[PDB]
C-alpha cells in the first residue's frame, strides 16, 4: 500500500503534485489524494476534505493560507490540525518574484482582466496622459531605469520572500521548504518565473527536489519528467535593456508575449494594455497605480526618468 499525500495551496500546489508524481521513486511510494486549491475549493469541498481526506493522510504538503484569506475553514493551520497522529505536515513557500517583470501586476480594484496580468507602468503612463506611441518609443529608457535599479528590485523581492518565511500566514510556523536563496543565486542565469507567481519547470523541479530531500530521499532517487512545465499558460516579456542582465535573453528588441497559450508581439500587446486601461475611469487607474507604486519605488522612478 502506497502512503497517501495531498498538496494544498495556490495554483502552485497542483503543479507541485504533478512534478512529484513524475519521479518514479516518489510515485512508487506515494498516492496523491487531490485537494482543490485555496482559490477554487467550495465550502462543501473543504468541509469534506477535513473529514475524509486529511485524517487519512501520511503527508500534507501545503502552502501557507491565512485565516484572513477566506476564513478558518480554508486556512493551512486549521487543515493541518486535523492530520492523524503519525502524519507529517510540511509547509512549502508560496513563490512570488517580480524581478523579471517589475512593471507587471494583477489589476486589483479594476475590472477582471481575462489574462490576469497588466502592465502597471502603462497604468501610470495613462494617468500622466502619455500616449501609447510615446510609450513604445521609450521602452529602452524605461528598461535602462529598471537596469539601474536591478539590485534594489532583487533585494526587495528577496526581503518579501524572507518575511513570509516566518510564516504569519501559517500561524507563525516557519516555512519548511523554501527556495529564496536558490532564486537569488540563479535568477540571472536561468529563467525561473514566467509571471510573478508562475514558476517555470526549472524552479518547480528544484522545489519538488527539496520536498523529496525533506522526506528523506537520497539524492540518487530524485529525478523528474523534464517535459513537464505546469504553469506555462502565460509568459511575460522582459523589457529592452533590462533583459540584457539575463543570460537567456535574445538579440531582438523585446520578445513576444504569450497570453493564454497564444503569442502576441510586444507592440500590439502593449497597445492593447493601453486600450484596456483607457476603458476604466482615470481616477480608478490612478488609484491602482498608486497602490502598486507605494512599495515599488523603481516603478515611479522609471515613469519619471522616461516621461516627466
Ligand atoms: C497568496 C495567496 C495564496 C494567499 O494569500 P494570503 O494567505 O492572504 O497571504 P499572502 O502574503 O500570500 O498574500 C498577500 C498579498 O500579497 C501578495 N504577495 C504574496 N507573496 C508576495 C511576495 N513575496 N512579494 C510581494 N507580494 C506578495 C499576494 O499576491 C497577495 O495579494 P492580494 O492580497 O492583492 O491578493 C492568494 O491570496 C494569492 O495571493 N494568490 C492569488 C493569485 C492566484 O489565484 N494564484 C493561485 C491561487 S492562491
Ligand atoms: Br492536485
Ligand atoms: Br497542474
Ligand atoms: Br497529478
Ligand atoms: Br463555496
Ligand atoms: Br493564519
Ligand atoms: Br502540523
Ligand atoms: Br484579474
Ligand atoms: Br517605437
Ligand atoms: Br506566504
Ligand atoms: Br532559502
Ligand atoms: Br542555493
Ligand atoms: Br533559461
Ligand atoms: Br524551465
Ligand atoms: Br513522511
Ligand atoms: Br553514487
Ligand atoms: Br530532474
Ligand atoms: Br519565455
Ligand atoms: Br529561457
Ligand atoms: Br528575455
Ligand atoms: Br520572440
Ligand atoms: Br469604455
Numbering used by the authors: 4 to 311
Share the article's original sentences.
The principal CPS of the human pathogen and Tier 1 select agent Burkholderia pseudomallei consists of a linear repeat of –­3)-­2-O-acetyl-6-deoxy-β-d-manno-heptopyranose-(1–. This CPS is critical to the virulence of this emerging pathogen and represents a key target for the development of novel therapeutics. wcbI is one of several genes in the CPS biosynthetic cluster whose deletion leads to significant attenuation of the pathogen; unlike most others, it has no homologues of known function and no detectable sequence similarity to any protein with an extant structure. Based on the structure and on biochemical and biophysical data, we propose that WcbI functions as an acetyltransferase and requires another functional module to carry out this function.
No radiation damage to the crystal was apparent after the first three data sets, so the exposure times were increased for the low-energy remote data set, which was collected over an interval of 360° to a high resolution of 1.56 Å. The high resolution of the low-energy remote data set was crucial for subsequent density modification and successful building of the WcbI polyalanine model (605 residues out of 622) by SHELXE. For the correct hand, the correlation for the partial structure against the native data was 36.5%.1 The full WcbI atomic model was built by ARP/wARP using the polyalanine model produced by SHELXE and the low-energy remote data. This was found to contain bound CoA, carried through purification from the expression host, and will henceforth be termed the WcbI native structure. The structure of the CoA complex of WcbI and the native structure were refined by PHENIX and CCP4, respectively, to resolutions of 1.38 and 1.56 Å, respectively. Interestingly, in the native structure the CoA terminal SH group points away from Cys14 toward Cys41, perhaps owing to a more reducing environment of the crystallization conditions. The two structures of WcbI presented here, obtained under different conditions, suggest that WcbI allows some flexibility in the CoA head group.
